[PDB]
Amino acid sequence: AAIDECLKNAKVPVTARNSTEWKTDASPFNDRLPYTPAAIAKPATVEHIQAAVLCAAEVGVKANPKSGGHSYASFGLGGEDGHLVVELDRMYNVTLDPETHIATVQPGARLGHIATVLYEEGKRAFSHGTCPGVGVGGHSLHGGFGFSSHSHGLAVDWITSADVVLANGSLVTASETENPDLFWALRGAGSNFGIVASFRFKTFAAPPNVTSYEINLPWTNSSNVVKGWGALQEWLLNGGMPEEMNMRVLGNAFQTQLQGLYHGNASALKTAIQPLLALLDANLSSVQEHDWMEGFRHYAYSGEIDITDPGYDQSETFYSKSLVTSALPPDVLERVAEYWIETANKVRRSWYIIIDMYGGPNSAVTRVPPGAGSYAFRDPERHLFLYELYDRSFGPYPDDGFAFLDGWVHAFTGGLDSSDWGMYINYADPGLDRAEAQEVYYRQNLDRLRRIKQQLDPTELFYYPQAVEPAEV
Ligand SMILES: *Cc1cc2c(nc3c(=O)[nH]c(=O)nc-3n2C[C@H](O)[C@H](O)[C@H](O)COP(=O)(O)OP(=O)(O)OC[C@H]2O[C@@H](n3cnc4c(N)ncnc43)[C@H](O)[C@@H]2O)c(*)c1C
Ligand SMILES: *[C@@H]1O[C@H](CO)[C@@H](O[C@@H]2O[C@H](CO)[C@@H](O)[C@H](O)[C@H]2NC(C)=O)[C@H](O)[C@H]1NC(C)=O
Ligand SMILES: *[C@@H]1O[C@H](CO)[C@@H](O[C@@H]2O[C@H](CO)[C@@H](O)[C@H](O)[C@H]2NC(C)=O)[C@H](O)[C@H]1NC(C)=O
Ligand SMILES: O[C@@H]1[C@@H](O)[C@H](O[C@@H]2CO[C@@H](O)[C@H](O)[C@H]2O)OC[C@H]1O
Ligand SMILES: O[C@@H]1[C@@H](O)[C@H](O[C@@H]2CO[C@@H](O)[C@H](O)[C@H]2O)OC[C@H]1O
Ligand SMILES: O[C@@H]1[C@@H](O)[C@H](O[C@@H]2CO[C@@H](O)[C@H](O)[C@H]2O)OC[C@H]1O
Ligand SMILES: O[C@@H]1[C@@H](O)[C@H](O[C@@H]2CO[C@@H](O)[C@H](O)[C@H]2O)OC[C@H]1O
Ligand SMILES: *[C@@H]1O[C@H](CO)[C@@H](O)[C@H](O)[C@H]1NC(C)=O
Ligand SMILES: *[C@@H]1O[C@H](CO)[C@@H](O)[C@H](O)[C@H]1NC(C)=O
Ligand SMILES: *[C@@H]1O[C@H](CO)[C@@H](O)[C@H](O)[C@H]1NC(C)=O
Domain of 60? Predict the structure, then answer.
């Protein structure tokens, strides 16, 4: 087709439809949501990215970058058939400057590869998610929360500059001192404004020891969930969680526990966690001290860490939702608990819920000021918890299945004003319509996002079904 001929004349490397690599390059992370691209460009340099983008514009097709391919809605594939996919995973180099400790990171580098290189070359790190296969591109441009985030913030907070290919093929560098509107827009909503062709990340010195630990929670009936969560949120909101502690609740039908990573040794952790243990009447278990990389591996849930192979093919079949909330009133705690116990525990599919200890007085995430970036959830009281709800099938996903997580999310949102909750596009939920998605993902920052969108991509070349809409002028 025309897109194929344009890419060829422009000397852009591609994955041919009839090749062996098509299957790998086109395949989603979420097997529930395959899409068939118009074509797959396979850039080795920013020049190829520019030329691919220009081809999409000249020919009249939409284009989307795919970095790690982990979008829960397959938005890296375009979220529908027939987009040019700019597959970035042949571009994964990570360079660490010994002087400034700034990392130059190509946009197809996956988190495990990044973590490995930064640690091996200078014992450095930045704050990012668990999950070695996740691409830096989607992850860092929309937030990025992991077991260093209470201590050090979101992945997006470590970006110091980015080189961007715009919808008309122009190159720009965005930073605090250059294209500041674009830099603001990238840092929360970056899928909408161009293809980032190179990132520069600041780093921190990796702690020599981290300590993983667990606290089992007796959340086997509704009253125990309510009292336990009510205590936990009061503890967090009143500054109980020290900077060095990073923690979440992981629940499934068969066990509920706090899981943590403490940036320090085991004796220091025991001292730091004692107040919470006394409040919950609970005990520590599985206390394990690690070096920095073993700490990462511990929560990776993956055999491979330093992943760079273009053959990468990890995939699951699922539906997922997210939330960001304040502390929850007990009426909401009761509804959420009843749903958990009476409904979720009886669902005959693998599911889990993660409640990250996200905000409160000591969180680095919510110390970032309200105007710093488009990422919407920075209030240390109002943005207290971040949630992942995940519903996974081993066969085909049942078409009536969506009601399960939908009902659970309703148990929260029915009792919270829209100023006290949002959603998180790193757990992209294609059940939301486009208007709803923009509002819940970006909240108070949507209007300015829409204005920048009209300025930078008025034709919506980077369209996907939950993309920011350009403002009308
Ligand atoms: C599969 C998976 C996802 C995880 C895991 N663990 C996480 C964690 O511990 N914390 C988190 O905050 N998130 C976790 N996630 C979710 C991922 O963070 C999100 O799913 C990321 O958005 C995935 O990023 P990536 O792998 O790059 O996904 P893509 O599908 O390629 O892209 C998503 C989105 O971003 C746009 N995009 C990619 N690359 C670019 C560039 N270079 N420029 C602009 N826009 C870009 C895509 O077009 C698409 O819209 C653990 C697991 C197992
Ligand atoms: C990423 O880094 C490596 C260097 O480690 C680059 O490797 C060079 O690749 C070119 C061909 O592209 C060869 O001529 C050189 O011999 C390679 N050098 C080494 C040391 O192997 C690679 O090109 C870079 N990749 C990207 C996508 O930029
Ligand atoms: C490519 O798009 C960019 C961004 O929209 C254009 O740059 C803008 O041009 C307008 C009009 O001249 C200026 O007022 C803006 O300040 C520019 N923005 C930036 C970020 O520099 C650019 O003109 C476009 N190029 C072409 C050929 O269409
Ligand atoms: O087997 C499950 C893991 O696959 C799951 O992995 C989670 C993926 O989403 C990320 O945001 C989480 O950090 C990560 O733990 O963890 C739970 C486990 O049951
Ligand atoms: O910051 C808050 C602390 O003040 C609180 O500490 C407890 C206060 O009550 C006393 O009985 C206990 O000795 C002490 O641990 O813990 C919660 C935290 O958010
Ligand atoms: O394409 C999928 C949609 O069909 C799905 O829509 C949901 C179906 O079940 C209804 O009860 C829900 O209200 C509705 O949102 O959402 C997921 C998407 O991938
Ligand atoms: O005005 C914009 C429309 O042009 C855009 O239409 C999309 C174009 O790509 C097609 O594959 C989609 O199906 C179609 O919806 O929709 C968004 C709107 O802002
Ligand atoms: C603490 O860190 C060092 C390297 O920083 C590591 O080799 C050692 O095994 C760690 N200690 C424990 C108890 O795991
Ligand atoms: C919930 O379970 C606990 C045991 O952990 C029990 O003491 C309590 O009475 C139970 N409450 C109800 C209402 O079933
Ligand atoms: C644990 O950490 C503290 C500082 O937080 C340090 O003084 C102490 O020596 C450490 N313990 C061990 C066994 O290294």
Answer: 1-208+438-473
